[PDB]
Design a protein around this nucleic acid. Structure first.
Lengths: 59, 111, 176, 82, 79
RNA sequence: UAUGACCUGGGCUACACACGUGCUACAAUGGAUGGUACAACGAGUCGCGAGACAGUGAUGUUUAGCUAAUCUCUUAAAACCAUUCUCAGUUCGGAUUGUAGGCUGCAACUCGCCUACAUGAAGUCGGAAUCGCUAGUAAUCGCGGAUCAGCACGCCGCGGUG
């Protein structure tokens, strides 16, 4: 399930109609910044630290 | 005749005096507003004398208003049981968009 | 009239084709109409029906009289009463003052699928008919037709021949 | 529409049963089916997921997909509706 | 007739113009008025110029409703 | 040897019914008549995508420009005058529908739209009550992201009026 839901979209499916992208830590569903290739929820787990020029204190 | 002679109102344009009528409207009633050259007209309590006589068959392009009735009828009443995935929903009564009928669409859905 | 002449001369062939030949003075022939509201409905006020009597004076066959029901219905409590729905009971050369409406005006105005009424079998050469609204008879009907209260239309031949009656009306004006 | 869309393997059963025999059901799959005028007068199955529905076709069945051939959208139905 | 018909037959000064085919008398509508137009209380045009074939069950047989029916619901090359 | 899976479509969104739930209306400040002027307005020559265009619009037909303090977006609306509908279930009010088309994608019913058009239901200001609103604050109008092939009234921020 972590591999049918992490490894499966890593495996080549039909199209973008089928293999919707997400971050590569945990294959979490949408609300995913494809402009930065990472989930909101998983990128938040970084945003504990944050490597971004955005202001960190929840503007 | 009569099609254009049916149930004259005053005070209006012929376009609203034909959307007023079952059918001919904002594409076509403005098209024959111009094709009979009417253009508001009336607001008069007089249509014309003879742009009627133009707009008998100039109006009679829609086939037909009674066969709009028999066009909904002739369409769907053949179109009953193609599926009947759509006909059953249309005539049982829900708006058959494939529409989310959980709570709302309350009037046509029936409370 | 006009359909006297085209009647007789146009049925002189249909004399021979249909039932009687040689009865050249007395062949089948129309009788009359009756034109009635007959709605019931009198128990509300009877006065709206007393504007249906002006609808029958408006269609203007003759004097718009009314009938009394034989028993007064317990489900309608109307206590026999004379207003029930209107009456003419119009006949003759007044029918011949009335039929060109039927054949070249009335239903060719209302355009409702040539008004088929083949169901109208009155046993012996008579033929019923009804109507819902009347936008018929120009410059007489309008500004009070906010609801046409109805009318019924029954033609009747002298003959008992139903199909020759079908050829007798449907001889002229109205297919079924 | 422009750039049409149609079945493939049971298009090869349109062309494998139109020529041969108009009889049998199919373990179908289609959200991607149509109906041609030649197709009328035969029997095909509809894949709900358990019941490959044996429906013959009439000309009324215009070129929809097997996701809407017959309402195999299982919803019971006759209990509390409308 | 009644004597002095206090009901209708009242003469509105109009015309039962063409293919209603009536003129004017003690009369009020439709099939009743008279048979002539060659003196003309008003002149015979105001109603209509096309006959009972003005009914669209027969107006040159009224097959102008055709074509309809077989393009319902599919003679097409889509999908 | 199974609650672990590959495929396949149907469910996941289905509806007798309550509250969660915003917009739209009921109207003349509207609704048509036009031509405004504005902050935004971020991704991008990976993609946005001209005054090149068939148009009713989806989209092509061209993609000009486009590594953005270039460019298509980015020309937002009310205030503006022009005519009427100045009174009404109302040029209404937009429930559908039947379609007739395009876009997306391998495929638009489940399980996206959008553009027509025709019919255009409620609805004529909202029980008990509730909640919010002491400044650009309610109210209000737009823009973008937002997800994403497709797809966002409420969904983030910014400001236009007040």
């Amino acid at each position: 399930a972590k591999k049918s839901m992490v490894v499966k979209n890593q495996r080549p499916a039909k199209f973008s109609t089928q293999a919707y992208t997400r971050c590569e830590r945990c294959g979490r569903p949408h609300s995913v910044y494809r402009k930065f290739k990472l989930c909101r929820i998983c990128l938040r787990e970084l945003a504990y630290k944050g490597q971004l020029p955005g202001v960190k204190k929840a503007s | 005749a009569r099609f254009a002679g049916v149930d004259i109102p005053n005070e209006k344009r012929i376009v609203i005096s034909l959307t007023y009528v079952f059918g001919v409207g904002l594409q076509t009633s403005k098209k024959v507003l111009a094709a009979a050259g009417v253009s508001e007209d009336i607001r008069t309590k007089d249509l014309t004398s003879d742009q009627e006589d133009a707009i008998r068959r100039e109006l009679d392009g829609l086939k037909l208003e009674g066969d709009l009735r028999r066009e909904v009828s002739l369409n769907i009443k053949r179109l009953m049981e193609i599926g009947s995935y759509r006909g059953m929903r249309h005539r049982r009564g829900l708006p058959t968009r494939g529409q989310n009928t959980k709570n709302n669409a309350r009037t046509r859905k029936g409370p | 009239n006009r359909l006297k002449e085209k009647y007789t001369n146009e049925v002189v062939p249909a004399l021979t084709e249909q039932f009687n030949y040689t009865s050249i003075m007395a062949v089948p022939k129309v009788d009359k109409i009756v034109i009635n509201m007959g709605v019931g409905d009198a128990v509300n006020n009877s006065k709206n029906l007393d504007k249906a009597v002006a609808e029958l004076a408006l269609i203007s066959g003759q004097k718009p009289l009314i009938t009394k029901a034989k028993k007064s219905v317990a489900a309608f409590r109307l206590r026999e009463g004379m207003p029930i729905g209107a009456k003419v009971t119009l006949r003759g050369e007044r029918m011949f003052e009335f039929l060109d409406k039927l054949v070249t005006v009335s239903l060719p105005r209302v355009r409702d699928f040539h008004g088929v009424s083949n169901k109208a079998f009155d046993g012996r050469g008579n033929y019923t008919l009804g109507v819902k609204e009347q936008l018929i008879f120009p410059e007489i009907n309008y500004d009070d037709v906010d609801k046409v209260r109805g009318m019924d239309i029954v033609i009747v031949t002298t003959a008992n021949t139903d199909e020759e009656s079908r050829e007798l009306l449907a001889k002229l004006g109205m297919p079924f | 529409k422009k750039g049409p869309f149609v079945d493939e393997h049971l298009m090869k059963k349109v062309e494998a049963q139109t020529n041969a025999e108009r009889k049998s059901v199919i373990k179908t799959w289609s959200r991607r089916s149509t109906i041609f005028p030649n197709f009328v007068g035969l029997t095909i199955a509809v894949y709900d997921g358990r019941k490959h529905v044996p429906v013959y076709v009439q000309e009324d069945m215009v070129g929809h997909k097997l996701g809407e051939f017959a309402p195999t959208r299982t919803y019971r139905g006759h209990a509390a509706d409308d | 007739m009644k004597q002095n018909i206090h009901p209708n037959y009242q003469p509105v000064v109009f015309m039962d113009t063409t293919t209603g085919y009536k003129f004017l008398t003690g009369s009020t509508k439709g099939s009743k008025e008279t048979v002539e137009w060659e003196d003309g209380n008003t002149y015979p045009l105001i109603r209509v110029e096309i006959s009972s074939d003005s009914h669209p069950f027969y107006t040159g047989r009224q097959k102008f409703q055709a074509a309809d029916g077989r393009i319902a619901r599919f003679e097409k090359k889509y999908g």
